[PDB]
């Protein structure tokens, strides 16, 4: 089962890269949302 075990490890590494993408894009999104909100509110 060491072959399948290796597949699992490779999939997890692939999953991580995807989670990192989601994590960084989320940050950009919320930061943009806050700016948009500010453009529509009294300052």
């Amino acid at each position: 089962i060491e072959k399948q075990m290796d597949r699992v490890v490779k999939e997890m590494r692939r999953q991580l890269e995807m989670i990192d993408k989601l994590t960084t894009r989320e940050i950009e999104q919320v930061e943009l949302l806050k700016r948009i909100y500010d453009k529509l509110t009294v300052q």
Copy 2:
């Protein structure tokens, strides 16, 4: 392969923690989007 299995388990819980934080931040985005929409809706 008990060493590998164990590693998979650790990594999974680590990535689940990242996905968890991600779901919480998405909730902030949805809430912020609703506030933006209201600022654009005749009240």
Copy 3:
């Protein structure tokens, strides 16, 4: 290793529930974004 194998399966089931949440929240977000965009554009 059947014990650790079971932990893996349980973590994956937990991961799925989280991915479903992200998936549905994303839909709500984009739908709201499109509406907001429409409120700011010629119609």
Copy 4:
């Protein structure tokens, strides 16, 4: 447990496919947010 291992592998790739589609949709959100911001920025 080769049956379980195999199952884990299948499920992982299935969930990775869902995360994959998720990352693509986030890109649409970021792009849509930039367009909304510009509609609010003196051009």
